[PDB]
Each structure stands twice: as structure tokens, then as C-alpha cells.
Paper text:
[name] (GTOV), first recognized in 1989, is the etiological agent of Venezuelan hemorrhagic fever. As a result of the rapid onset and high mortality rates associated with infection (∼23%), GTOV is classified as a high-priority category A biothreat agent. Together with other South American HF arenaviruses, such as Machupo virus (MACV), Junin virus (JUNV), and Sabia virus (SABV), GTOV belongs to the Tacaribe complex of the New World clade of the Arenaviridae family. The GTOV genome encodes two highly glycosylated glycoproteins which facilitate host cell attachment (GP1) and fusion ([name]). Upon acidification during clatherin-mediated endocytosis, GP1 is released from the virion and [name] mediates fusion of the viral and host membranes.
We present here the first structure of a New World arenavirus fusion glycoprotein and show that [name] adopts an archetypal class I-type postfusion fold. Approximately 50 residues at the N terminus of the [name] ectodomain were removed to exclude the aggregation-inducing N-terminal hydrophobic fusion loop. To aid crystallogenesis, recombinant glycoprotein expression was performed in GlcNAc transferase I-deficient human embryonic kidney 293S (HEK 293S) cells, which traps glycosylation predominantly to a homogenous Man5GlcNAc2 glycoform. Each of the three [name] subunits in the asymmetric unit consists of three regions: a 45-amino-acid N-terminal α-helix (residues 301 to 346), a 50-amino-acid “T region” (residues 347 to 398; named in comparison with the Old World LCMV [name] structure), and a short C-terminal α-helix (residues 399 to 408). The N-terminal α-helix spans the entire length of the 85-Å-long molecule and connects to the C-terminal helix through the T region, which is composed of loops and a small α-helix (residues 358 to 364). The N- and C-terminal helices pack closely in an antiparallel arrangement, where each protomer associates to form a trimeric coiled coil. Our structure is in a postfusion conformation, with the N terminus (fusion loop region) and C terminus (transmembrane region) colocalized, consistent with the merger of the virion and host cell membranes. The crystal contained protein-glycan and glycan-glycan lattice contacts, which facilitated visualization of carbohydrate chains from three out of the five N-linked glycosylation sites on [name]. The T region also contains a 10-amino-acid stretch (residues 365 to 375) which is fully ordered in one protomer and disordered in the second and third. However, superposition of equivalent GTOV and LCMV protomers leads to a greater structural variation between the two structures (a 2.2-Å root mean square deviation [RMSD] over 96 Cα residues) than expected between two structures with 50% sequence identity (an ∼1.0-Å RMSD).
Residue numbers in the entry:
A (entry chain C): 295 to 358, 369 to 406
B (entry chain B): 293 to 407
C (entry chain A): 293 to 356, 367 to 403
Write the structure that this text describes.
């Protein structure tokens, strides 16, 4: 019983570490991409005489370039990962340990 | 007894992995689409500032190395790395094991057979 | 019997996390490499347009839209994402031990 709780605990901790790693990775990538968006918009605004180029406005990636896709609405918001199940597993471990009243 | 509690613990872990898979898929796909939009705009810029096309494209050996140099790369501007071949395809996370876990739960419950 | 079935359930979860780790590493590394290529091309553009020399580089730190100052530099390149398999490796070692019982 104790060995099986340990196996569950390993899996649960491995998932936590992966969640942390993915959160760190995505947030690092998101911030880097946002910096590229900002610089690309800054370039566009300073080669203003080249703005014969229109903005796409409503169109997305239907077409599997003729207009700008990136706007000040393109910035990615930080991706905060939901640890709801991991937190419930932590609470379940505390409970599992309590039923031990023998 | 205790068997049912251990199935519940497995179920929590399985569901947590499923949610993380979904979250990572959503994140990657969102990032991919945003990066593809940046590629498109950068290519569109390049095509309209034809007086900047004294700049050559990376002679695939250069390009392969830049994508394989498992570091923060030297890169110091030399030729174009981004082409219409740089677009990222959507990321499809393979819930292979989670789907098999769901099928394993149905089996575990059947193997309670005992009369 | 039920012990062997519970080890199999743990094994499924452990392998599912493994596969996800592999997938995320592949995805992030692919994204990182693509973003690094965009950084390089954007810097290459900046270096070949002397008419944009007026544009300053950002005074880094905190306090971060309105167009002003370069954010991307040769210090912006992302390093490859090393996905540690610490727990998975320990689980693999624990399985070998469980089987010895
Ligand atoms: C991966 O997943 C796990 C699962 O949850 C996640 O969990 C983390 O677990 C670690 C282990 O403890 C947690 O670490 C703690 O973080 C505390 C947060 O403090 C922050 O803010 C501090 C404020 O600054 C002022 O106050 C501090 C004193 O509080 C003072 O020293 C400063 O000078 C300043 O006046 C800041 O200091 C702190 O920075 C760290 O480094 C400095 C450098 O020396 C040190 O002086 C600090 O004390 C601190 O260590 C940080 O930015 C932190 O306070 C805490 O430190 C004390 O308490 C812990 C116990 O709680 C003791 O073990 C430790 O020895 C210290 O006495 C400790 O560092 C972490 O917060 C958990 N995170 C979450 C989300 O729960 C991991 O983080 C995940 N990994 C990821 C995402 O990468
Ligand atoms: C990353 O991206 C995401 C994607 O959008 C982004 O999400 C947005 O987050 C912002 C907040 O940061 C959301 O907007 C805020 O909502 C606050 C909540 O107040 C609400 O209740 C008000 C009460 O009205 C009542 O009566 C009416 C009927 O008469 C009824 O319909 C209402 O439901 C309610 O019962 C309501 O008036 C108010 O309305 C605002 O928001 C709605 C959309 O939710 C919009 O349609 C309205 O036109 C109006 O803007 C709202 O429903 C609100 O207090 C807050 O206000 C800010 O601005 C005012 C000045 O305009 C300041 O005085 C105030 O202090 C706040 O600064 C703001 O509107 C927004 O809706 C989210 N987006 C979506 C799609 O939901 C994240 O934030 C991003 N991350 C960032 C930025 O870090
Ligand atoms: C980094 O990447 C870039 C990206 O491509 C790469 O650029 C290429 O550079 C190579 C040269 O190194 C280019 O190819 C060379 O072009 C030489 C020029 O000769 C031309 O004129 C010939 C005359 O024909 C006339 O009549 C015909 C109609 O009949 C008419 O169309 C012609 O325009 C012209 O009026 C013509 O025959 C010849 O054709 C070759 O090139 C074209 C493409 O330009 C191709 O479509 C043909 O099939 C044919 O290959 C050309 O237009 C040419 O002399 C040279 O030849 C080499 O090979 C022969 C043997 O086949 C050797 O005998 C000779 O000594 C040379 O070694 C070669 O073809 C290539 O076109 C560039 N790419 C592009 C898109 O333009 C850089 O080189 C890369 N950096 C590196 C490799 O370091
Ligand atoms: C991205 O990857 C590069 C590749 O290594 C990381 O660079 C490394 O950063 C460390 C941090 O200082 C350098 O260490 C230094 O070594 C000298 C040598 O004795 C020592 O005197 C210093 O006190 C320090 O220990 C390391 O040399 C350097 N390596 C290279 C090739 O640059 C970089 O930090 C990574 N960036 C990240 C993860 O954000
Ligand atoms: C993956 O994440 C998405 C993002 O919300 C979840 O979306 C929900 O999907 C359920 C399934 O029908 C809907 O009922 C909800 O209304 C959706 N929510 C939103 C905001 O769209 C999705 O369920 C997650 N995958 C899971 C839990 O398996
Ligand atoms: C993957 O993306 C590249 C980039 O353009 C594309 O050429 C290739 O066909 C894509 N693979 C697919 C859609 O299977
Ligand atoms: C990749 O997936 C396989 C499939 O189970 C797994 O055995 C292997 O350890 C994984 N590699 C990782 C997570 O680095
Ligand atoms: C950025 O490029 C310049 C140009 O030579 C170089 O001097 C500088 O050291 C580079 N930044 C690095 C290597 O971090």
C-alpha cells in the first residue's frame, strides 16, 4: 500500500515538474514573440512611406502575403497553467495519510 | 477496500495529465499561429523593400546549422533564415496513453467480476 | 493479480507523461528555433536600413502598445529547452525495484 502511494507520488510530482517546465517555456516564448511583435510594428511605423500595404483586418489563416496579419491586438497574454488537479492530488495525499488511524 | 482509493489516485493523475496535454496543445497552437503571422509579415516587408534584396537567402547548409546549433546561436546577421518553408504546422498532442488509460479503467472495473 | 493491474495503471500514467514530455520538448524546441530565425532576420533587416538609425534600443529592466525603442537584441535568442526527465527516470528505477519484490 505504502509502495503504491509512493508510485502515485512519483507520477504526481513528475506531472508538477512538467507543468512548471512547460509554464516557464511558454512564458519565455510568449515574451520573446511579444518583443518581436513590438519591433515589427515599430519598423512598420518608421518605413511609413511603404504603408501602401493594407491590414488584413477580418481575415485569418483560411489560406492553406497581401496584407498585415500582426497588429497591436496580436500580443500574447501570459499563459498561466491550471494546476487544479495537481492541487486536488496534494489534498488527496493529506487525506490518504489521515485514514491511517490504526 | 483501499483498491478503490488507489483507482481514484490513478484517475486524479490521469485527469491532471489530460488537462496539461490540453493546456500545452492550446498554448503551442496559439504560439504557432502567432509566429506564423510574424513570418508572413516579415516576408511581406521583405517583398516590398526590394532595395534591401542585396541580402541573400541562407544556402540551406547555413539554414540547417542555425536550426541544429543546440545553443542560443552565433547567427550575427549574414543571410535570410525565414522563408515560405518556415511556417510551423499545428501541434497535435497525442493523447495515446490517456485514451488507453480510459479503456484500462473500463477493464479494471469489469475485473471486479468476483461473483 | 490486482497488484499487477495497479502496476500497469501506474505504468500507463508514467508513459503518458513521458510521451507528453517528448512532445512538449519537440514542440518547444521547434518553436524556439523558428523564433530565433525571426530574431536573426529582424536584426539583419535593422542592420541594412540606415534610415532607421534614429530608433533607440530600450533601456531594458522593468516598467513595461505605443511604438518606441527596440526590444529585440542579439541577447534575445532563446536557448534550447531541456526537458528534465528526473521523475520519470526515478519511476523507471522504482519499476525495476517493484518487479524484484
Ligand atoms: C516547481 O513546482 C513547485 C511546486 O509548487 C514550485 O514550488 C516552489 O517551492 C519552492 C521551495 O521553497 C518555493 O520557494 C520559496 O519561494 C519564496 C518566495 O519568495 C520570493 O519573494 C521573496 C521576497 O523578497 C524579499 O523577502 C525575502 C524573504 O522572504 C528576502 O530574502 C529578500 O531579500 C527580500 O527582502 C524573494 O526574496 C525570494 O527570493 C529567494 O532567493 C533569495 C536570494 O537569497 C532569498 O533571500 C529569498 O529568501 C528567496 O529564497 C522569492 O523571489 C521564498 O521566500 C522562500 O524562501 C524561504 O522560505 C522557504 C520555505 O518557504 C525556505 O525553504 C527557504 O530556505 C527560505 O527560508 C523559497 O525560496 C517556491 O516559492 C514555490 N513556488 C510555488 C509557485 O509554489 C516551484 O517554484 C516550481 N518551480 C518553478 C516554477 O520554476
Ligand atoms: C489578456 O487578454 C484577455 C482577453 O480579453 C484580457 O481579458 C479582459 O480582462 C479585462 C479586465 O482586465 C476585462 O474587462 C474588465 O472587466 C471589469 C469587470 O466589470 C464588469 O462589470 C461591469 C458592471 O456592469 C453590470 O451591468 C451590465 C448591464 O448594464 C452587465 O452587462 C454587466 O455584466 C454587469 O452586471 C460592466 O459594466 C463591465 O463592462 C466592461 O467589460 C465588458 C466585458 O467584460 C465590456 O463589454 C464593457 O464594454 C466594459 O468594458 C464588466 O462586465 C471592468 O470593471 C474593467 O474596467 C476597466 O476599465 C474601466 C474604464 O473603462 C476602469 O474604470 C476600471 O477600473 C478597469 O480598469 C474592464 O472592463 C475584459 O472584458 C476581458 N476580456 C474579455 C473578452 O472578457 C486580459 O485582461 C488580458 N490580460 C491583461 C490585460 O493583463
Ligand atoms: C546560395 O543560394 C543562391 C540561391 O539560388 C544561389 O544562386 C544560384 O547561383 C547559381 C550560380 O552559382 C546560378 O546558376 C548559374 O547561372 C550561371 C549563369 O548562366 C546563365 O545564362 C545561360 C545562358 O542561357 C541563355 O539562353 C537561355 C534560353 O535558351 C535564357 O533563358 C538565359 O537567360 C540566357 O539568356 C543559361 O543557360 C544559364 O542557365 C542555368 O541557370 C538557370 C537559372 O539561372 C537554370 O534555370 C538553368 O537550368 C541553368 O542551370 C544561366 O541562366 C550558369 O552559367 C551556371 O552554370 C553552372 O553549371 C554549368 C553546368 O550545368 C557549368 O558549366 C558552369 O560553369 C556553372 O558551374 C549556373 O547555372 C543559379 O541560377 C542561382 N539561383 C537562382 C535562383 O538564380 C547561390 O549560388 C548560392 N551560393 C552558393 C552555391 O555558393
Ligand atoms: C544560453 O546558453 C549559453 C551557452 O553556454 C549560456 O552561456 C553561459 O553562461 C554562463 C553563465 O556565466 C557562463 O559561465 C561563466 O564561465 C566563466 C569561465 O570561467 C566564469 O569565469 C564565469 O564566472 C561564469 O561561470 C558560460 O561560460 C556561458 N557559455 C557560453 C558558451 O556562452 C547562457 O547563459 C544561456 N542563457 C540562458 C540560459 O538564458
Ligand atoms: C481543454 O481546454 C479547453 C479551453 O477551455 C476546454 O474547453 C471547454 O470544453 C468543454 C467541452 O464541451 C466545454 O463544455 C466548455 O464550455 C469549454 N470551455 C471553454 C472556455 O471553451 C476543454 O474542455 C479542455 N479539455 C478537457 C477538459 O478535456
Ligand atoms: C509543414 O510545414 C511546412 C512549411 O511550409 C509545409 O511545407 C509542410 O507541407 C507542412 N506539413 C504538412 C502540412 O503536413
Ligand atoms: C518518448 O516516448 C516514449 C514512449 O513511451 C518513452 O518511452 C520515452 O521515454 C520518451 N522520451 C522522453 C520522455 O524523453
Ligand atoms: C552582438 O553583436 C555584436 C557585433 O559584433 C557583438 O560585438 C556582440 O558581442 C554581440 N553580442 C553577444 C555576442 O552577446
Amino acid at each position: 500500500f505504502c509502495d503504491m502511494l509512493r508510485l502515485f507520488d512519483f507520477n504526481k510530482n513528475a506531472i508538477e515538474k512538467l507543468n512548471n517546465q512547460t509554464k516557464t517555456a511558454v512564458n519565455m516564448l510568449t515574451h520573446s514573440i511579444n518583443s518581436l511583435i513590438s519591433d515589427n510594428l515599430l519598423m512598420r511605423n518608421k518605413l511609413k512611406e511603404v504603408l501602401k500595404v493594407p491590414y488584413c483586418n477580418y481575415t485569418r489563416f483560411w489560406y492553406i502575403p497581401r496584407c498585415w496579419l500582426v497588429s497591436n491586438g496580436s500580443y500574447l497574454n501570459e499563459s498561466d497553467f491550471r494546476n487544479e488537479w495537481i492541487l486536488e492530488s496534494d489534498h488527496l495525499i493529506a487525506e490518504m495519510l489521515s485514514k491511517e488511524y490504526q
